[PDB]
Symmetry: D2
Subunit: 340 residues, 4 copies
């Protein structure tokens, strides 16, 4: 029996990537797509690259409940929370931030909406490499942000084994344009962004409390992250360069990373002194981690690269769906990066 | 499982063969060679591949032993030479050594004599035109990337006598991966567009060969390629005179391709973007008419590394081993 | 006499390039700037790159008439025409199409507005390499479109000397995105354009009748242009590839081209066998032309490259300003392309 | 009219020197040499230069004859060597030969002992810090591109004791222009990568200049990244502070108020690299992470102009008593 999958907000870039992934997934099929703007059209009329002849639906919760086992939501902040209340017997994988936070007061501070009744929702942060045991039994998964995915994966072995000083962590992060999310104003025009790099939302970015939640959970201690994102003139990819103090040797750390990720099919620890290129990830669910030590100041440099649209969004969402349905976690995700 | 080897696994077409073949449900990589990087695992050179096979130094005895089929991506003429040394291995050459029906034409444009050619059971590997002959071929001459785009763009028009085949103008645009010396450096190519090899490109006689077979009349092509600052994709803008209506031609295109899983004729008024093909074996074709001059404008887009090279190579293999033509190739373009 | 220059629509990309040129121009200075979107803001608050602290005005004809000897206008279609009636004693160089056409019925057909009173206006098409003699004494110049500038410069010697068959000319052109301007439509978003090439407006583009007008005048014959533009994933630059039948040799045509442009400072006929790269023009008012013959069909291929924002727009405008005020035509335009 | 020679005219820094000197009202090119293309017209190699001059095979007699000032763009150590065998010529070295005060630092990092160094009147060619010394130099080590961005970002903070100078972290991003198979278009396009992490030759150069300004030892952690664009450097700098962001911004406005090429942006506004494009201008922004008291400074330059050839011309102007902006007055090309 094929998992029956629905996508709300199917015409955004993360929706398109769920379409690609689910079409290829040998144990799932698309039974529902919705869009407000394009309701009534075949998805391939809007995006011929999708090769998807399915008509876009105007969202109706009874139709979803009848036609879907699982539903991916890619919607403006707060919309998934509201629409999910009406559904019956459908597992939810939300690509936004509505279900990411353990404490709904933090979501409210950063996203400006109260999540009434949160205490009744069995939700989990969808990072399989940290939470697969809980994801297995979840009804609602809050799919991680793209920067948090890159960062938490970069830091987990270090924090789990207290190999670094987690009190202050510096994160200088570089993302292709698709990683800033749905943004159609002047600053995201080709002519503005092309051939230019810029910092944005320096130190106050909604991803910070999210990273901190997960990093603090691992370490057992409050983690304050200093976070600077930069918009890079390429479509996709994230490189997070992470700086933290340590009194350990690079060798001990590298062994610890190897050990931690040895059975994780999507995370690849590089040899010491080899640093990741973002395009090594292109189109795939794979993550590459490299590291260096600055010896004079005892500063560990961790470098993690992911494809923000895949392991940073829709690939990880499918990964979560596999876990929730008890499938081999690489199902529909067994393919390699596209290069060059 | 089909046992597949790749000679020249560290070129871009090689890397895409590796991607496609790893994912192929009825085939597996049993051999990989590299003149430059032998003795290293493929993923040491190109981590993106995630392939731990050590790269071999080419040895025909090992190939004959381990491979049912061999993909070759070499300097011109080299595939011709190494294929003599092999026996009982099917060959799909990504180069030009086996493309031409008349080896005199190859000689003229590639400056090498192909001895004993008439004794080689070879075929031009464009499945949408020659799948019945590829089925029984021992050696396939995998089409070049511009010809793939041009021939697919013009096939219905020429088959159905809907245009004047006499003179066809082809203005083509390729990303860099499909056209390294100092001129192919990032700072040189970036943020610039240039024509190259104008009306003197080795793909021209290749096009004329295939286009004339379809037409049943002589075709002269005027061909201008242009280097575009992006990594991949081809768009061929084709101009030809016609006395037929656009509606007529469009209906003909839909009919011609109706059962072809990799060619997609767009709705009238809609023009292809090259990135609509990205990473996939799929082709999009659009058209317009300039009505005052009775000029049909055909536009086709392909990913030059996939349908333009390695995907077509895999498609050809499927045909040769009696597999469903789309095996290993079903997946859709990546976007954006 | 520093020439006093006003710019209407200072915050579009052609307006920005006018500011860069005119700040550097030794015999002109900016005395008026207006903007419909950003009036009341300093230009450098919108575009810090401009390094221009002047406050952007809300357009007022009295102030223009008072403070300017010349006025560049970059407005939507029809707008420059309307405002020009309300003005006196000011030369006008319109970057749009309102004054480009000899026949206002052709303009109406393609741009949809009626230009009443047109035959009282002494306007001239501002292509200096063809019309500098008339531009000298004009009060209103319709500054050519960017694709026309490339195409006419590519064809002029051939048509003037009857070296080709001008009845049917096929033009396959390629432009960077900046041709579109700073218009926030989703198609012009970085993520949509990047890494892709697309034809657009095939055989139905407003520049066609404008090309045909100028090409007809210099051939003395009716010219039908078949024109396919393509959007290229780069910011600036136009390459026009032009196909025309000829009974002459390439050697004779090359000879005629060299002779025709021998004394034009901005047009550079390349060596035979050499083709232009668009970036060779970057930031400058210079043009490169190459050519080839396809001998079996007697098809001449002409290739011309310009920077669309400079010789294709604001640079050509300043060149026309120099001509109109009797200055050395290269003034403020002496700089060479920036490379790489 | 100053007579300028360029040794190494077919590199990118050479090409920008040609464009800038051609436009310079009070200088002119009297010598062009190329180790690679000697014998050919410059425009046979780069048609965009519009330069029909034939490239010379370097002859120090013809140089001594024909130039007041020479710009050198050669492989490291290469001049030094020919510099000493010249006289009556101002030298602006675009390489690292003359940047270092301690030539032992140069030899450990660049692998070459510089004998006779101590009696050469050389200076570090950063006008915004050293113009008075540059005024009377006969040799300038033109600063590397990354140090240029990093030092201008930090100068007011270090000068006015506004930050803990003890440990400074620099995460730098550069366009490709800032050779082999991995510099090919298809390799670099649509990809970002760190390189030379922790171990980069520009680190000792920064620590030299930052220490001078603070009057206290400065340790720099520096990590560069290759960005898929042609030009532009963005340096993102992290440093602990006990001062308010407001006070730091005021100090930056004061320190740079009379500096024509350095522009401190309003608070909240961060620089785009393309805002500098083709120009000698610098943009600085900043923010505070309040919980940790971490200052984030951000500077953007054009690596080929203020990072290389434009700073060089700025230095020529100073050496010859010209307005520092001569030939450099033009604004960024945008978009």
């Amino acid at each position: 029996h094929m998992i029956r999958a629905g996508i709300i907000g199917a015409t955004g870039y993360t929706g398109l990537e769920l379409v690609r992934l689910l079409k290829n997934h040998p144990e799932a099929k698309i039974t529902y797509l919705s869009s407000r703007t394009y309701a009534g059209k075949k998805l391939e009329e809007i995006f011929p690259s999708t090769l998807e002849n399915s008509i876009l639906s105007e969202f109706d919760p009874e139709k979803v409940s009848k036609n879907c086992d699982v539903l991916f939501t890619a919607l403006p902040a707060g919309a998934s929370y509201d629409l999910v209340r009406e559904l019956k017997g459908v597992k939810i994988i939300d690509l936004g931030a509505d279900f990411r936070f353990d404490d709904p007061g933090v979501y409210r501070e950063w996203y400006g909406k109260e999540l009434s009744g949160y205490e009744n929702i069995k939700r989990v942060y969808g990072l399989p490499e940290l939470h697969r045991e809980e994801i297995k039994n979840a009804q609602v998964v809050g799919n991680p942000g793209c920067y948090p995915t890159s960062v938490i994966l970069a830091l987990a072995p270090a924090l789990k084994h207290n190999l670094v000083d987690p009190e202050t962590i510096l994160v200088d992060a570089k993302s292709g344009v698709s990683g800033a999310g749905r943004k159609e104003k002047v600053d995201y025009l080709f002519s503005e962004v092309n051939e230019s790099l810029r910092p944005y939302n320096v130190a106050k970015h909604r991803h910070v409390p999210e990273m901190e939640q997960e990093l603090g959970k691992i370490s057992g201690k409050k983690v304050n992250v200093v976070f600077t994102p930069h918009l890079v003139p390429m479509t996709r990819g994230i490189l997070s360069t992470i700086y933290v103090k340590t009194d350990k040797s690079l060798e001990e750390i590298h062994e610890a990373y190897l050990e931690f990720y040895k059975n994780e099919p999507f995370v690849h620890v590089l040899p010491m002194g080899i640093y990741p290129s973002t395009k090594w990830c292109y189109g795939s669910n794979h993550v590459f981690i490299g590291m260096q030590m600055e010896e004079r100041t005892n500063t560990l440099i961790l470098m993690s690269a992911i494809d923000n649209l895949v392991k940073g969004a829709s690939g990880q969402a499918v990964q979560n769906m596999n876990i929730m349905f008890g499938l081999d976690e690489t199902k529909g995700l067994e393919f390699t990066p596209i290069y060059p």
